[PDB]
Amino acid sequence: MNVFNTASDEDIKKGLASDVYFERTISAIGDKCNDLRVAMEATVSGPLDTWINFTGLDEVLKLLEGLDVDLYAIPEGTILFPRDANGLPVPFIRVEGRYCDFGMYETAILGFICQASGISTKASKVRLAAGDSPFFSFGIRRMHPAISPMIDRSAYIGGADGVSGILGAKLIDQDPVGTMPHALSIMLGDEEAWKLTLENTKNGQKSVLLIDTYMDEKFAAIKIAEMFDKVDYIRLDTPSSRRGNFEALIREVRWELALRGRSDIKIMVSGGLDENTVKKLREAGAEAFGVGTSISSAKPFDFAMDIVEVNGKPETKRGKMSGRKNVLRCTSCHRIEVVPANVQEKTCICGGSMQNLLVKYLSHGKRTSEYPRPKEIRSRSMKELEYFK
Amino acid sequence: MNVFNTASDEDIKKGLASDVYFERTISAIGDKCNDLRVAMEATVSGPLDTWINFTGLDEVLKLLEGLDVDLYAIPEGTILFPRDANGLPVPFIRVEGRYCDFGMYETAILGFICQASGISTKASKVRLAAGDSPFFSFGIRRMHPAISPMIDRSAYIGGADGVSGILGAKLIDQDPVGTMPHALSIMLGDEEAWKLTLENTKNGQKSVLLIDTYMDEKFAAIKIAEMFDKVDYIRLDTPSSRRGNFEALIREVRWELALRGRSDIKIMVSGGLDENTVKKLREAGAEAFGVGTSISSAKPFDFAMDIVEVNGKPETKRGKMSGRKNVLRCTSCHRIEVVPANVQEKTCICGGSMQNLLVKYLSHGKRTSEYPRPKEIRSRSMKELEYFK
Amino acid sequence: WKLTLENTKNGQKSVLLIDTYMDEKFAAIKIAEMFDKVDYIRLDTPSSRRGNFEALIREVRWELALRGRSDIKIMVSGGLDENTVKKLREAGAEAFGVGT
Amino acid sequence: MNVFNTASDEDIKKGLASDVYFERTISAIGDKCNDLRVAMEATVSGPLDTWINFTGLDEVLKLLEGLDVDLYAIPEGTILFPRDANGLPVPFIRVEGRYCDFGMYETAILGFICQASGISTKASKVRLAAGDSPFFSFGIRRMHPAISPMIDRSAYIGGADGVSGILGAKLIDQDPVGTMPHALSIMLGDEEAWKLTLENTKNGQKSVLLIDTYMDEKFAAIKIAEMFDKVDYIRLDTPSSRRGNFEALIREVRWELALRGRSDIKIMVSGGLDENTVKKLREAGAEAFGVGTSISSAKPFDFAMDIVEVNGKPETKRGKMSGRKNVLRCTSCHRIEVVPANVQEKTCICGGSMQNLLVKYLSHGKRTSEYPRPKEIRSRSMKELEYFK
Ligand SMILES: [Zn+2]
Ligand SMILES: [Zn+2]
Ligand SMILES: [Zn+2]
Ligand SMILES: [Zn+2]
Ligand SMILES: [Zn+2]
Ligand SMILES: [Zn+2]
């Protein structure tokens, strides 16, 4: 094993990152393993009072590729409610094959979609609040570094314009984002910190000065206004105990800057931000946002996975619906209706037609298509998020 | 890089799992790097209305070992409030050395203690509720598999008697825990599933039959009572929609079993359990608990890290307290009072004496002691948790 | 501040208003290492700057004691209540200005 | 000084009714006084969740007249929100001159507009609730008699049709209003009290009989109906402990009167009335209201006054906006936008144009116009109140 308390890719692929009951159960089944073919579907037990931005499927395919199983799933970036128009639980993925062949991967499969999805969904909420103002994922520091890249990836797919993590940036194929830290002003002083920042930032990227280290934001803004000229943004990461009314403070700063003819200096805010916070601060004048904890710590959706068919016959347990299923969605209004797997489409009068969403990504362990890059996926989410305001 | 969206140990050690601003800032500082020695302390900005079971330090030492820095920290498993008796923020770790030498590790350092601590703290809350009844960590499936081991480790340290993850079990040096899955009853039927379970479980471990797959828990209990004899536990993972009043259902089942002289069959419950849920169900008769999501998804504590001294002089930013500090605790009542680093201890009249808690774990990159194994750490937490009811 | 100190002699205590321009914390440090005959520091901190007045006061008090100037007492004013007074005093405030 | 605990006009004009820090501070400044010219603006720190009916300016002019200062203000009776369309604090008055010349009057200046404004604003709320039914200011008895006239003046300006105070009436140039007191019925009995009341009231004024002294309002109404004929109103000042459901009691009384063909007798109510109470009771049939305590004790708006410019240069403190300013309002929709003092007006597309509201009332201590009488001011408020329902 490795140094830190993590499971390597090798380990998760070997089925070591799972609840032991699986291998012990498969072991007990013995030769019956050769006669037990199943179909399992993942549904959200979790929060049912919100829509979801599905994410984490890419990880699932990396794990099941090579095994003799068929896999169906809703594409990443698809946004929808966990229950259909008639309150039926929506299946996001279906796996078919010999139970003993992939049963041990249930733990990891759920793990890949539960946490990631909560993150991308929360980022989409923030996306709606930020409107045409950009926001960036800044929270990987609140979670274990090992999952640093997946967090920034889902945050990006969910709507984030940029990301701060190096590996996350590499993974989404974008340049990392970053502004000067408080540490710089503490070590060299504001004036030198700002000078150094401006000198180490040339066109192709915007200038950003952190101003809350020592002074009152208002006077820091006036000082910067009459000291430099090539400053695109002023960033306020104002301490909680100093944040009596962040909105009024921002209006005050904006007025003082415009008074000296420097309304060209835009305002960026960060620190304990929410979809709620973002909306208010932007209505107050903030034009850029740094969002961390609320997104990186987003509660995971509670996905469950269970057998829905055995050797071709529909079969489940109490609290679950049997049979393999398809997920139909109206091409015009996005209404959804889950149906038995033998119903490919349904005619409607509303607008357009109802087509299957649960699509096959793996056939006998082989990919059925080239997987989309992160940019393409978030591009899809942004279109999808349109249907939700 | 690796297959999944994770950062390898190699990567986190190279400073790749971090916000880019650090390396870009260190790069900008240049030769000044040789003249900037600092001391940074991690304090909880986070939830201040609860105590905390500190955890994740082991990971921090693995990363800084080998670098020329001194490290002080509160031992893992120590339980205390984020603010002292006088409302002062408590520092959990202090790092000393050339800023440019470890500045990039801030992201990972916070990551190691934020999420882990939330998990161990939540497990301790559950520990208090479970009393003398055992509970096990079953939630790694709700989070990304890569951090599967650290979750079970912190859950164990926080009070969990057992863990389900293979790697988590290996890491704490305990046998994984596991009961038959619903899948087994769906594939082979209850009778065969139970028979197989009993046959594949011999003394050294207790027998546990999952009974909610097909029947009403009450009649499943009666049937099992008059069908087998060597059954130690009956487990109810009763579906949410079937859980009208779990407490009354459990009393009903317990009565029916005692009526047939089988009160020897103990009851275990699992599924959407909390410290609150555990308490109620145990008061109703449950003697074993499976706890997952509430613990594995525990919100991370919001730790922040900032320079508190530069080249020997106290220096911080707005919202932080300058100077290196010690954390004194009364040996008898556990009252805490943070003080300047030059105050090793203080005399008191209450009970005993006040001694420093923030102890040195690294001296010039070398360990100052042999690190405790997980069992020893949770053994410490259990004693510590005594001071909180 | 200089004018205030010069126009205040024993029989009355010295009080410096510190929230006009700086962050209360750094105003406190500056005053600590600039004057000596200062009995009180007064914070009439603006509403929009008052995120957590209690924590701000503890922070200021710590920084002053760190430089051996815990002799400087703290006075607060602005939107105070019986409720506010109690909390702030438990946080270290030793004098209060109560109006509205 | 005088007998009662009050400051005479002489005293307030001498700067004796103020916080001593002003004179002691001005004294300390010495000759610097000759080189310190400033501009101070009064803004509402106070309630920001309600509009305001500005009042008390007349008092301010009486005090500053004769001093070498310029004064700008929003006219009395203007109704608007304390923050503009963009959340900027609105200045209601601006004073220009040598600081030491008027600095001591800050206490009195705020005093004149804080309490008066709360009173006129509350009266306007009542005005909206009373609709086309008249209401009168009856509460000077709840406040110190010395400020008896200003209270009735602001209540009138805010919407009151009449006032009970002698000096208040004289000041607004209206006849005081008054009905027989309970004392009269207690001393002479209801019958004699009513007879005396009717005999001492001739056309030019309406007859009003107080009926709740001894009987149940319902039977008092029947008795009066069949005893007198020239009775215009019946007044119910019903005791709190007897007021189970004032609305139903009023309907009951109104029915009984109409049954005997005396629906000509109108109903007036008084006692613990609010904008809320007035509305309900009028919907129940009350056509006249006596309103005291809720208006006379109206909480004062929290106005603050601070330097916004020094020797021609914009300059303020944290939490305030620097520079002299104008208050522009759309002539058609009343939208408001505060701007720098060098922006007299702004073009808009909505409706009409945006013109300055903050007008000069004093130039070098001389009035720039003849001040409006109370009737003219409330006439303005009533038009202004139209924009608020
Ligand atoms: Zn359709
Ligand atoms: Zn449709
Ligand atoms: Zn002690
Ligand atoms: Zn003690
Ligand atoms: Zn207009
Ligand atoms: Zn308009």
Swiss-Prot record, chains A, B, D:
Transiently phosphorylated on a His residue during the reaction cycle. Phosphorylation strongly increases the affinity for substrates and increases the rate of nicotinate D-ribonucleotide production. Dephosphorylation regenerates the low-affinity form of the enzyme, leading to product release. Nicotinate binds at Y21, F138, T179, R235. SUPFAM superfamilies: Nicotinate/Quinolinate PRTase C-terminal domain-like, Nicotinate/Quinolinate PRTase N-terminal domain-like. 5-phospho-alpha-D-ribose 1-diphosphate binds at S240, G272, T293. Keywords: Ligase, Metal-binding, Nucleotide-binding, Phosphoprotein, Pyridine nucleotide biosynthesis, Transferase, Zinc. One of its GO terms (molecular function) is nicotinate-nucleotide diphosphorylase (carboxylating) activity. Its EC number is 6.3.4.21. The keyword Transferase applies. The keyword Ligase applies. Zn(2+) 1 binds at C330, C333, C350. It catalyses: nicotinate + 5-phospho-alpha-D-ribose 1-diphosphate + ATP + H2O = nicotinate beta-D-ribonucleotide + ADP + phosphate + diphosphate. Zn(2+) 2 binds at C330, C348, C350. InterPro entries: Aldolase_TIM, NAPRTase-like, NAPRTase_arc-type, Nic_PRibTrfase-Fam, Nicotinate_pribotase-like_C, Quinolinate_PRibosylTase_N_sf, Quinolinate_PRibosylTrfase_C, Quinolinate_PRibosylTrfase_N. It is an enzyme of class 6 (ligase). The modification Phosphohistidine is found at H182. Homodimer. Forms a trimer of dimers in the crystal. Catalyzes the synthesis of beta-nicotinate D-ribonucleotide from nicotinate and 5-phospho-D-ribose 1-phosphate at the expense of ATP. Belongs to the NAPRTase family. Highly divergent. Consists of three domains, an N-terminal domain, a central functional domain, and a unique C-terminal domain containing a zinc knuckle-like motif containing 4 cysteines. This is Putative nicotinate phosphoribosyltransferase. It comes from Thermoplasma acidophilum (strain ATCC 25905 / DSM 1728 / JCM 9062 / NBRC 15155 / AMRC-C165).
